[PDB]
PDB file of C-alpha atoms and ligand atoms in Angstrom:
ATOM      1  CA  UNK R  15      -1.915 -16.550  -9.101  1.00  0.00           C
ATOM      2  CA  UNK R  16      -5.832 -16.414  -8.617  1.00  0.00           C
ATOM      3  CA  UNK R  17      -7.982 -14.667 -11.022  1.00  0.00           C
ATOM      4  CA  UNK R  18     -11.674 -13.840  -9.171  1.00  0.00           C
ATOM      5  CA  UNK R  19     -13.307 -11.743 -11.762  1.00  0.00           C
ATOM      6  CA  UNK R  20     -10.873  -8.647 -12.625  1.00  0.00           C
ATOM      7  CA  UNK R  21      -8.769  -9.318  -9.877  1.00  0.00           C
ATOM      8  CA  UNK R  22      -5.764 -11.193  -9.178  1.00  0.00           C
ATOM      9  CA  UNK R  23      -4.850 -12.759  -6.078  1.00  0.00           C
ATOM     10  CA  UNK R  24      -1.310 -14.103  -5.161  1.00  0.00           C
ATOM     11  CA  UNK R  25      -0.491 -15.819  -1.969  1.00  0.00           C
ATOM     12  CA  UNK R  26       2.635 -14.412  -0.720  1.00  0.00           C
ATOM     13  CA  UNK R  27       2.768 -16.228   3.146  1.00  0.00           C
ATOM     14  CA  UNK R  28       1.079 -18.224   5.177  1.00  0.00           C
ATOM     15  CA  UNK R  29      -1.213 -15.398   6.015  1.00  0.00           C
ATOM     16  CA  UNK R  30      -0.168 -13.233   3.624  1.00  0.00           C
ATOM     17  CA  UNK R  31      -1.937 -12.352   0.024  1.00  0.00           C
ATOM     18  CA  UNK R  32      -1.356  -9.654  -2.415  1.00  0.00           C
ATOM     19  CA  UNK R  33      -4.258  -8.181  -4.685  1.00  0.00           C
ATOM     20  CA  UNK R  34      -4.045  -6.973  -7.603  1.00  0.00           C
ATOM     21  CA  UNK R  35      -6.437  -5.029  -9.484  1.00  0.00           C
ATOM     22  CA  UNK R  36      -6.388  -3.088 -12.898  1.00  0.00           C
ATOM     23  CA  UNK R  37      -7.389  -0.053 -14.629  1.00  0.00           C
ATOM     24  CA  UNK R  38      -7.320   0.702 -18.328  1.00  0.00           C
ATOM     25  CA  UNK R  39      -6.402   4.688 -19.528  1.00  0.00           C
ATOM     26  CA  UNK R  40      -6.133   5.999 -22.031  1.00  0.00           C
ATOM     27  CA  UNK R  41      -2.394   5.838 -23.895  1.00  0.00           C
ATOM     28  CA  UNK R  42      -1.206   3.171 -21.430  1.00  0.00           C
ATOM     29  CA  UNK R  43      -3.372  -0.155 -21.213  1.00  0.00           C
ATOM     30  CA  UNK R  44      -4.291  -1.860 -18.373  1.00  0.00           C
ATOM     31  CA  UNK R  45      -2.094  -0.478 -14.997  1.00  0.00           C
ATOM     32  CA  UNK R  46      -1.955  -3.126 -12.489  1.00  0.00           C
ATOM     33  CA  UNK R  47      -2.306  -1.652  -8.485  1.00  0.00           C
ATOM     34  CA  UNK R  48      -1.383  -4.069  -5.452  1.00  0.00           C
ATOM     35  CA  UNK R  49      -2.435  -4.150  -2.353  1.00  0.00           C
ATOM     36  CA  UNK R  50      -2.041  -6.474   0.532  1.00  0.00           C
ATOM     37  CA  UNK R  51      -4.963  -8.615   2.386  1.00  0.00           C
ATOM     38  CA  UNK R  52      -3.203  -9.954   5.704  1.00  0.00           C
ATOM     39  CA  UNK R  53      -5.125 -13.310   8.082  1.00  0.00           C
ATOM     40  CA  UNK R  54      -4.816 -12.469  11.872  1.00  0.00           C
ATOM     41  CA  UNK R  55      -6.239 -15.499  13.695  1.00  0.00           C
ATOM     42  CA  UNK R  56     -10.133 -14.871  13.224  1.00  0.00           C
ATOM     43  CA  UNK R  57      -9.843 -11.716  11.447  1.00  0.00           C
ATOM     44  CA  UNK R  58      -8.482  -9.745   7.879  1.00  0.00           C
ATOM     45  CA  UNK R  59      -6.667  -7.071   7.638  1.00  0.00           C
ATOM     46  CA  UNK R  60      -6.296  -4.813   3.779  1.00  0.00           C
ATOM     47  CA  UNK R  61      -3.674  -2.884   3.006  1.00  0.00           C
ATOM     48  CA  UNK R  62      -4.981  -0.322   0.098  1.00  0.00           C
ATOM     49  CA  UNK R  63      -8.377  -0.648  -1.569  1.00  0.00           C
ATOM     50  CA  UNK R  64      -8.182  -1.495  -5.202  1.00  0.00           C
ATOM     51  CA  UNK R  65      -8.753   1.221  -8.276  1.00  0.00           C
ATOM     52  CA  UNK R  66     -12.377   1.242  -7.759  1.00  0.00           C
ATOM     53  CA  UNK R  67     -15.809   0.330  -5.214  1.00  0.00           C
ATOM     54  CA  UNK R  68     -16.488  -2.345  -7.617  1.00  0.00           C
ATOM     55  CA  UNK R  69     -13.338  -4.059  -7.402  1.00  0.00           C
ATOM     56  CA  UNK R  70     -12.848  -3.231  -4.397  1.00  0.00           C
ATOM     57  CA  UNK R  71     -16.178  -4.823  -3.189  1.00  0.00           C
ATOM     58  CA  UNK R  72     -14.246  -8.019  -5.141  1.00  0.00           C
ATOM     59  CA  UNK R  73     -11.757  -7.816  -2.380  1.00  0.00           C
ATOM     60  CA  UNK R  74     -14.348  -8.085   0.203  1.00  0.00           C
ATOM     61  CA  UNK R  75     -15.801 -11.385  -1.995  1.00  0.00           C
ATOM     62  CA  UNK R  76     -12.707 -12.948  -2.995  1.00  0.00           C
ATOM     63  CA  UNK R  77     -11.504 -12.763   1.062  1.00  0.00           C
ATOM     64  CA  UNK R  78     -15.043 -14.216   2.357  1.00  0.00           C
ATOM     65  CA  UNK R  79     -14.737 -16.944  -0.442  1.00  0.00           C
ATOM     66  CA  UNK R  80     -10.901 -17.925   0.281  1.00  0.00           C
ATOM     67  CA  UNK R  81     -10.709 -16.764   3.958  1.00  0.00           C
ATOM     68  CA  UNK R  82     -13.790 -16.460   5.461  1.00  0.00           C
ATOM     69  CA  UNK R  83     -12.630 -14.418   8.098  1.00  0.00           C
ATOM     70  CA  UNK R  84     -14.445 -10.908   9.106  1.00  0.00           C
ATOM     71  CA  UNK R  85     -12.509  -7.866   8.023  1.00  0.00           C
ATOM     72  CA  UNK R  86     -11.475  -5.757  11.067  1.00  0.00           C
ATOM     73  CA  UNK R  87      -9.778  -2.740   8.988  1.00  0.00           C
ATOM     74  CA  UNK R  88      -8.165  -1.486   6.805  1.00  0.00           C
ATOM     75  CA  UNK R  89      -4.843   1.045   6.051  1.00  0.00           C
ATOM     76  CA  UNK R  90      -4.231   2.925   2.940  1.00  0.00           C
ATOM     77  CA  UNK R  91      -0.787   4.260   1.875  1.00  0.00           C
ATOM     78  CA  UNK R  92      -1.933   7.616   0.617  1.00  0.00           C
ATOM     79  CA  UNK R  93      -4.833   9.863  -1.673  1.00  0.00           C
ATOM     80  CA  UNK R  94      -3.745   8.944  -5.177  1.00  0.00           C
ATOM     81  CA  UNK R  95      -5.992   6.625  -6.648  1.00  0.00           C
ATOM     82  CA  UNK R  96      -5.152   3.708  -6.879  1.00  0.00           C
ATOM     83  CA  UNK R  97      -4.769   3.272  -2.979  1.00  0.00           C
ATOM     84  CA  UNK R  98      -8.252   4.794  -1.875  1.00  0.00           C
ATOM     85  CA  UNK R  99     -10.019   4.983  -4.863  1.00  0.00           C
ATOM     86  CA  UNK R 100     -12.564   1.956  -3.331  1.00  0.00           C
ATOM     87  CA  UNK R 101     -12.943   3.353  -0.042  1.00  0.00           C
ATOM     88  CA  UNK R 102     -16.604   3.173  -0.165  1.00  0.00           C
ATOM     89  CA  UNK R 103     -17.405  -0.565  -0.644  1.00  0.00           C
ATOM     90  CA  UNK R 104     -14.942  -1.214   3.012  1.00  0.00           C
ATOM     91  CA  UNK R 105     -17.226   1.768   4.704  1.00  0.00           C
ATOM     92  CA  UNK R 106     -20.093  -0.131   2.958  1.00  0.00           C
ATOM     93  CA  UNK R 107     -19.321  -2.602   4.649  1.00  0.00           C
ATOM     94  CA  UNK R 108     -18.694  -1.933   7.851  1.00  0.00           C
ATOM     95  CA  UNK R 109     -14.684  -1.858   8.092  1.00  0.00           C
ATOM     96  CA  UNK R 110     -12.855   0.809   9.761  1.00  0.00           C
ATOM     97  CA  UNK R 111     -10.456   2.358   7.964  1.00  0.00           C
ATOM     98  CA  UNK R 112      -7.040   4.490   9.101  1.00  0.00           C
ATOM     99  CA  UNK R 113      -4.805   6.691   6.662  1.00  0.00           C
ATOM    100  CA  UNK R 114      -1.913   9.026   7.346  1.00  0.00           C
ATOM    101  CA  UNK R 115      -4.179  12.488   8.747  1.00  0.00           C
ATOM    102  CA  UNK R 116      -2.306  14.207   6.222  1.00  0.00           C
ATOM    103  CA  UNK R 117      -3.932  11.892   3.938  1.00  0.00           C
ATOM    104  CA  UNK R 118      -7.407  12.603   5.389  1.00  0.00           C
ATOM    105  CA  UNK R 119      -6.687  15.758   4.659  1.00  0.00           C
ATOM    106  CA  UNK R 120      -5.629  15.680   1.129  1.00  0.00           C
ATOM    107  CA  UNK R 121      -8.778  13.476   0.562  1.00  0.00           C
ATOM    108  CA  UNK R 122     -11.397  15.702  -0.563  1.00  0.00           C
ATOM    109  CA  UNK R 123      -8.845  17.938  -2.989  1.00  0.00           C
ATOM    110  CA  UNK R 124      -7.760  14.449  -4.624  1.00  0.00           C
ATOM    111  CA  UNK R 125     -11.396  13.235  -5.288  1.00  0.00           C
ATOM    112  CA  UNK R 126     -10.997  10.362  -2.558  1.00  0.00           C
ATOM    113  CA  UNK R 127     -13.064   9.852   0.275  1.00  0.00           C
ATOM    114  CA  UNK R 128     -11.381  10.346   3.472  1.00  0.00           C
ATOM    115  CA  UNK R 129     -10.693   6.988   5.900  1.00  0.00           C
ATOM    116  CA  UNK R 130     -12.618   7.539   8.882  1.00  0.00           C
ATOM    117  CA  UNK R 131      -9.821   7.427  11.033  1.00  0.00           C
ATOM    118  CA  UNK R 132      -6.368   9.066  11.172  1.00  0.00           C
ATOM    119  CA  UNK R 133      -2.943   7.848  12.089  1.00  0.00           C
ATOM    120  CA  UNK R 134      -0.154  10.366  13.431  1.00  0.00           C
ATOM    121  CA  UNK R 135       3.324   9.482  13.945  1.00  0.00           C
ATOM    122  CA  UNK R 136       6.496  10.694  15.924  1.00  0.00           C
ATOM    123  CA  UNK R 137       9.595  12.247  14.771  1.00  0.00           C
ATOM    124  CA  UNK R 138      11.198   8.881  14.022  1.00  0.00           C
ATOM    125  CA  UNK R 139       8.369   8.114  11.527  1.00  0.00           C
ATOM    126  CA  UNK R 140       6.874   5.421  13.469  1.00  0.00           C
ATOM    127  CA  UNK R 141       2.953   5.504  14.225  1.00  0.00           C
ATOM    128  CA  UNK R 142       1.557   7.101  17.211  1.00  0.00           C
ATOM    129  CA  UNK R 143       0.885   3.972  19.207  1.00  0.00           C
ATOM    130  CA  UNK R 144      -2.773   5.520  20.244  1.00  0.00           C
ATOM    131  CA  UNK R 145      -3.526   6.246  16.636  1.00  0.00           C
ATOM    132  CA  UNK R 146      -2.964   2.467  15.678  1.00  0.00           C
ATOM    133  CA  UNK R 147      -5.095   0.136  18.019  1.00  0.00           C
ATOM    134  CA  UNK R 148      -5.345  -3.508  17.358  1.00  0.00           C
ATOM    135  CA  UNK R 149      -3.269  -3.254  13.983  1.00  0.00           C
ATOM    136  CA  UNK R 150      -2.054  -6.842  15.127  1.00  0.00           C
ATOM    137  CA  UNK R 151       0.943  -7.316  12.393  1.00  0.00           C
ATOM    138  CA  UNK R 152       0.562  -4.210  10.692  1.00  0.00           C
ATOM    139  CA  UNK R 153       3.268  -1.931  11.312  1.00  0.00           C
ATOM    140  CA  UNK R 154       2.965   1.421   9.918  1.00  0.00           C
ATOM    141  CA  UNK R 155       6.208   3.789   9.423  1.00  0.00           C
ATOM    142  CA  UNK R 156       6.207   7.191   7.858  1.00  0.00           C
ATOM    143  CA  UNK R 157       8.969   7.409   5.990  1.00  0.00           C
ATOM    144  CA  UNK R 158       8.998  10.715   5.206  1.00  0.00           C
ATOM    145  CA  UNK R 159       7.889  12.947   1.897  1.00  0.00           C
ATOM    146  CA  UNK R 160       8.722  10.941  -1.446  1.00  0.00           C
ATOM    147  CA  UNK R 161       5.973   9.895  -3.970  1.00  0.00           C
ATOM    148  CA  UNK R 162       3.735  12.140  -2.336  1.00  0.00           C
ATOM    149  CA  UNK R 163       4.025  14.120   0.937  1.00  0.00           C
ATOM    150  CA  UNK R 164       1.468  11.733   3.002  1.00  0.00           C
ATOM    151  CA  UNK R 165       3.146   8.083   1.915  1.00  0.00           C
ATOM    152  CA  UNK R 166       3.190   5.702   4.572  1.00  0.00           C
ATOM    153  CA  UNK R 167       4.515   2.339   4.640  1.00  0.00           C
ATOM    154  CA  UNK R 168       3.482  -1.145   6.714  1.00  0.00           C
ATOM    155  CA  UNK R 169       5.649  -3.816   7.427  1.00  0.00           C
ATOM    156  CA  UNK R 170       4.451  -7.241   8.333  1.00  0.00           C
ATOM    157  CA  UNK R 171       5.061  -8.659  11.704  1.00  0.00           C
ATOM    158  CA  UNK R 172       5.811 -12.056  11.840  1.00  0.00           C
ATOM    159  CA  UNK R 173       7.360 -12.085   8.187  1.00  0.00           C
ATOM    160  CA  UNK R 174       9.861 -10.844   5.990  1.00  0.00           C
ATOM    161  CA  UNK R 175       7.456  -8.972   3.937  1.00  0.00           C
ATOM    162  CA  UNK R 176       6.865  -4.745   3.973  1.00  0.00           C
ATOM    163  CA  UNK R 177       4.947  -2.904   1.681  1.00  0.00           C
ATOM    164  CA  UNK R 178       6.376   0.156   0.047  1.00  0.00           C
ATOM    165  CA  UNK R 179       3.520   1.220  -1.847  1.00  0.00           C
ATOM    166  CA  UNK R 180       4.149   3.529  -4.817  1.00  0.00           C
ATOM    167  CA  UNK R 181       7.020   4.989  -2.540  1.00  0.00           C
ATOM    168  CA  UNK R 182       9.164   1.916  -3.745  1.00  0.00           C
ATOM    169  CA  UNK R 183      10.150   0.763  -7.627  1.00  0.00           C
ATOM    170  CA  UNK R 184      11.097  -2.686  -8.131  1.00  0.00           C
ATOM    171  CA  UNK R 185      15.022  -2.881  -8.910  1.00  0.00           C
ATOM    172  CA  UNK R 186      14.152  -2.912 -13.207  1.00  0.00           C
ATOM    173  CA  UNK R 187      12.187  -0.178 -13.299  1.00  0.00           C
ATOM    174  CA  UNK R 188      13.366   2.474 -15.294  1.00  0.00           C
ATOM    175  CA  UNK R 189      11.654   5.593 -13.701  1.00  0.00           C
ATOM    176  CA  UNK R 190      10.746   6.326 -10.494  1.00  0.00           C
ATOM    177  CA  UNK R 191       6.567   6.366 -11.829  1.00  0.00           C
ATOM    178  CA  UNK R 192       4.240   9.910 -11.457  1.00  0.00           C
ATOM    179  CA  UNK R 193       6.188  12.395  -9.766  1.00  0.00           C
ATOM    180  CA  UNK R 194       3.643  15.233 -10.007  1.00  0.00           C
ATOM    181  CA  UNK R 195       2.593  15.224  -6.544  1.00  0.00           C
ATOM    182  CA  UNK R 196       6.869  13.933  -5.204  1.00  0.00           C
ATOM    183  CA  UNK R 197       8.958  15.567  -2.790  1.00  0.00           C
ATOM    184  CA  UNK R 198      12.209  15.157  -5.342  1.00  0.00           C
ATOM    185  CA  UNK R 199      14.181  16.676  -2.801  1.00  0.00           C
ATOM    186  CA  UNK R 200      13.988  14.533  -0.064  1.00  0.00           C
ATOM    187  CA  UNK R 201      12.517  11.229  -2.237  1.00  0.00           C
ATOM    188  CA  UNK R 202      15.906   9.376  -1.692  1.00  0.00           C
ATOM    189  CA  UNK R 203      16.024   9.742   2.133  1.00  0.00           C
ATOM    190  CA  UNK R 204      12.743   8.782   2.688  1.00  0.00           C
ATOM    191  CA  UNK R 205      13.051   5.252   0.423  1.00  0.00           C
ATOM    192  CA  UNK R 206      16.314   4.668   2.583  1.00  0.00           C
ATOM    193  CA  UNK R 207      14.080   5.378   5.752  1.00  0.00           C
ATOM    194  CA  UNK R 208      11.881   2.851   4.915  1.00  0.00           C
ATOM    195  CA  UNK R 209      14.523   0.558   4.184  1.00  0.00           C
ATOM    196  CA  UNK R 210      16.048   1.120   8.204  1.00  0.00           C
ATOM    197  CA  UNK R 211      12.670   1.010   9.596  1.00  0.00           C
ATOM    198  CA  UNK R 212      12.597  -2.472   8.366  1.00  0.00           C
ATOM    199  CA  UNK R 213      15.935  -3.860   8.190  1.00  0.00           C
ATOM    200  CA  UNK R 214      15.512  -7.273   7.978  1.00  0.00           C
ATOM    201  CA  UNK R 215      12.063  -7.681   5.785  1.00  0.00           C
ATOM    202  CA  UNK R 216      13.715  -9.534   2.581  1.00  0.00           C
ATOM    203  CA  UNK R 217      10.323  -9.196   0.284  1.00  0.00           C
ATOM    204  CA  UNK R 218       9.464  -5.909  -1.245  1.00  0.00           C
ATOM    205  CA  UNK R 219       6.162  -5.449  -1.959  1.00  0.00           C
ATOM    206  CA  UNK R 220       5.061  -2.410  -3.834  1.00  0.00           C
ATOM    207  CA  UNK R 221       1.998  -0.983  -5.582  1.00  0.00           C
ATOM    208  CA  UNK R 222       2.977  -1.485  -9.788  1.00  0.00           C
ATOM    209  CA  UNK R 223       5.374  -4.305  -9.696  1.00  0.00           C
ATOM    210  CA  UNK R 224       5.889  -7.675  -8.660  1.00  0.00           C
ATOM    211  CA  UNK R 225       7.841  -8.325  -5.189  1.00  0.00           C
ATOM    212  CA  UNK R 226      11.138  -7.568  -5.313  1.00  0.00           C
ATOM    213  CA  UNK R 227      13.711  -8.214  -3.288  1.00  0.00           C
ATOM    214  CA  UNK R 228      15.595  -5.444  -0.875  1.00  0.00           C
ATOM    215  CA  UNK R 229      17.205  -4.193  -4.224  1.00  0.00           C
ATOM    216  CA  UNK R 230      14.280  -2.536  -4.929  1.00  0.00           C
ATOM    217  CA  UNK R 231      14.718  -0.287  -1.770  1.00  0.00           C
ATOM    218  CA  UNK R 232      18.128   0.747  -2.905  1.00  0.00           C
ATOM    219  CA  UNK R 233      17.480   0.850  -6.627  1.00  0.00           C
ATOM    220  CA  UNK R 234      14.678   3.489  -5.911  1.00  0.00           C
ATOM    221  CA  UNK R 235      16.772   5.702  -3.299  1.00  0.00           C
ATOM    222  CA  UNK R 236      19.150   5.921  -5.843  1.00  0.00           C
ATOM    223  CA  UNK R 237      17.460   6.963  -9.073  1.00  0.00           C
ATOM    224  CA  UNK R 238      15.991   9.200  -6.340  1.00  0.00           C
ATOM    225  CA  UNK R 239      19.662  10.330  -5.840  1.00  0.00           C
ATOM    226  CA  UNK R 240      19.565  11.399  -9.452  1.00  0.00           C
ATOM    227  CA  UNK R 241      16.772  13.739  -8.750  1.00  0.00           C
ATOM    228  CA  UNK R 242      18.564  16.579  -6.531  1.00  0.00           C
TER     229      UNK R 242
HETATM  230  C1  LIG U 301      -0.779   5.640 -12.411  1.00  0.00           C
HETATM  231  C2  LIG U 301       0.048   5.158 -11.213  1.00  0.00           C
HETATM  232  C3  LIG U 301      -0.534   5.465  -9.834  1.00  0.00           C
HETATM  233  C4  LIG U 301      -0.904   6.944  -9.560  1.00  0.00           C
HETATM  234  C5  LIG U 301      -0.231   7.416  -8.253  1.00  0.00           C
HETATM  235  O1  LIG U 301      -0.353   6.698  -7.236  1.00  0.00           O
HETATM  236  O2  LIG U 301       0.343   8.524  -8.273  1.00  0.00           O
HETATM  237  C6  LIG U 301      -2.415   7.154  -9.325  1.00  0.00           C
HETATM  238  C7  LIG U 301      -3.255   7.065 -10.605  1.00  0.00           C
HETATM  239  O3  LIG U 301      -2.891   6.207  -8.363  1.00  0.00           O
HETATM  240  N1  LIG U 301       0.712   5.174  -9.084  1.00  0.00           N
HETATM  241  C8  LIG U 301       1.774   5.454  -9.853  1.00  0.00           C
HETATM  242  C9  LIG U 301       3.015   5.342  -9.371  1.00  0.00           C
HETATM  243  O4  LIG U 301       4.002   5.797  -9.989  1.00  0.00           O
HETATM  244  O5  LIG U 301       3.175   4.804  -8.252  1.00  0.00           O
HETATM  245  C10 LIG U 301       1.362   5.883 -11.130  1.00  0.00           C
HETATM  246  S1  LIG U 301       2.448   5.413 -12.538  1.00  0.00           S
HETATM  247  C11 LIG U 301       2.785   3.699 -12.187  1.00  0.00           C
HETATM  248  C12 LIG U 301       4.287   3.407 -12.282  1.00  0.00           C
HETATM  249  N2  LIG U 301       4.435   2.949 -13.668  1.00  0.00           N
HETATM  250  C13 LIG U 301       3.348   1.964 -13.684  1.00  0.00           C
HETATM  251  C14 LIG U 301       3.098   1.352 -15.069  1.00  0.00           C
HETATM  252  O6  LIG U 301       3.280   2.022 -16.084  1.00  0.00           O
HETATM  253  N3  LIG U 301       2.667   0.076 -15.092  1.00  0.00           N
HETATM  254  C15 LIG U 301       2.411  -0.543 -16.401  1.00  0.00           C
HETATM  255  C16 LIG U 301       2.472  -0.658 -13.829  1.00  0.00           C
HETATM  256  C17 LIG U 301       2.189   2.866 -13.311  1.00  0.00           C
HETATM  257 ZN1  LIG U 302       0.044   7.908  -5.724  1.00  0.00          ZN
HETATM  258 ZN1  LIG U 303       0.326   4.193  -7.394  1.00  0.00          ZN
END
């Protein structure tokens, strides 16, 4: 991995990178957040801003540095805080940004600041093609209510990587994380969803663990299952 000031960096593909950043609270340390920064020929695309503006702006510097690439947007997965909490420094900067409208939404009510775009998606949980212009590899699928009602997940096109966000546990985890704003009820269904949506990705990434491998999908459905 590559440390650039509190930040982590770990290349995961060719054009692939996920970023980790870290806040300390109280009782429970430091609590590592990943995210996903994605090369598209001349351009970078983020997946989730880091805990913070500040670190988040570190983003921003570490892709300049290592990349040197413009950023054309960014997605976040949904309004808990360590997905948008650094929305400001990519609107600083100039980067569009899309979330789940339910996510939008939620925004102001979760102390985030609302993307400036919103996605929408059909009945089989994939994006409204209209609401997702230019995504290039990003592939967004909703896979339904399960760490929070507005979760969405992105796949990457082109390799076997898709990002479950907090949705997704790795295979040892031992809870399934803050369920104070989860859909218990229909948590297991939507972690399987994700799973069909992308059948064949063989790297799990997700927001408070290291990739896992497809386990992780199953693993989580089913200690899911134990919550109905
Ligand atoms: C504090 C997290 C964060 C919160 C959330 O997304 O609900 C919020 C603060 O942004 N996401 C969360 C999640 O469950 O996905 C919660 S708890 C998370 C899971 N156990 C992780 C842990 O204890 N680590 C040492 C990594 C923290
Ligand atoms: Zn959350
Ligand atoms: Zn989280």
């Amino acid at each position: 991995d590559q440390r650039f000031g509190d930040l982590v960096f770990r290349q995961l593909a060719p054009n692939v990178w996920q970023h980790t950043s870290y806040l300390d609270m109280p009782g429970f340390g430091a609590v590592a957040s990943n995210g996903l920064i994605v090369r598209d020929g001349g351009r970078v695309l983020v997946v989730d801003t880091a805990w913070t503006d500040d670190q988040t702006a570190q983003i921003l510097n570490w892709i300049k540095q290592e990349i040197n690439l413009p950023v054309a947007l960014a997605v976040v997965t949904h309004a808990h805080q360590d997905k948008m909490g650094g929305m400001d420094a990519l609107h600083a900067a100039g980067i569009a940004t899309y979330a789940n409208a339910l996510s939008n939404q939620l925004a102001p009510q979760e102390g985030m600041v609302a993307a400036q775009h919103s996605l929408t998606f059909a009945a089989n949980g994939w994006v409204e093609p209209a609401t997702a212009p230019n995504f290039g590899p990003l592939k967004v699928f909703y896979p339904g209510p399960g760490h929070t009602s507005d979760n969405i997940t992105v796949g990457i096109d082109g390799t076997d990587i898709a990002f479950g966000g907090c949705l997704i546990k790795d295979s040892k985890a031992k809870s399934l994380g803050n369920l104070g704003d989860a859909d218990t009820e229909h948590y297991a269904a939507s972690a399987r969803a994700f799973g069909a949506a992308f059948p064949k990705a063989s790297m799990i990434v997700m927001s408070h663990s290291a990739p896992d491998s497809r386990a992780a999908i199953t693993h989580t459905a089913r200690m899911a299952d134990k919550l109905r």
